Amino acid sequence: SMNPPPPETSNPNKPKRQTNQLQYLLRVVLKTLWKHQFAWPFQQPVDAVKLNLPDYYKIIKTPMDMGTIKKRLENNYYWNAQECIQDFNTMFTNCYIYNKPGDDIVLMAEALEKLFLQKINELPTEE
Numbered sequence: 046s047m048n049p050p051p052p053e054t055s056n057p058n059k060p061k062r063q064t065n066q067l068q069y070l071l072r073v074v075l076k077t078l079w080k081h082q083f084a085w086p087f088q089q090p091v092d093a094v095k096l097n098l099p100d101y102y103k104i105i106k107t108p109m110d111m112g113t114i115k116k117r118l119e120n121n122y123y124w125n126a127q128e129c130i131q132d133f134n135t136m137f138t139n140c141y142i143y144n145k146p147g148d149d150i151v152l153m154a155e156a157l158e159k160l161f162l163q164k165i166n167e168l169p170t171e172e
């Protein structure tokens with residue numbers, strides 16, 4: 046039943062970078078989805094005790110979520126955009142493995158992934 050610790054949002058060993066895309070992912074792409082109607086389940090780590098889902102973390106092994114993704118951006122945790130983009134693909138994949146096609150939660154995940162995949166069709170350029 047228990048909840049594991051959340052993903053790390055800071056890491057001193059890990060090198061950090063503030064590219065102009067990561068700035069965009071936080072200032073534009075992440076606040077675009079954060080405000081959406083379907084955003085709330087993905088706004089913090091899943092609570093398998095509260096949800097009474099004791100099997101969730103026996104099937105999901107790389108948990109991810111936007112709460113976690115948001116702070117990583119704020120901590121400059123990533124080295125480049127694709128690192129963060131891949132925290133998103135993990136999140137959505139976790140939602141489509143643990144649940145079934147058509148379940149309410151995946152319909153939101155699919156809604157988001159498609160507003161997602163549309164906002165990162167155009168990142169800003171480098172310096």
Ligand SMILES: Cc1cc(-c2cc(NS(C)(=O)=O)ccc2Oc2ccccc2)n2cc[nH]c(=O)c12
Nearest residue numbers: 086087089090091092096139140143144149150
């Ligand atoms: C990714 C995700 C998020 C949630 C979920 C999270 C919270 N809040 S919290 C504090 O983050 O854990 C509350 C209800 C939730 O279940 C919903 C199931 C259907 C429609 C709306 C919500 N779930 C539940 C089951 N499977 C999942 O993959 C999942």
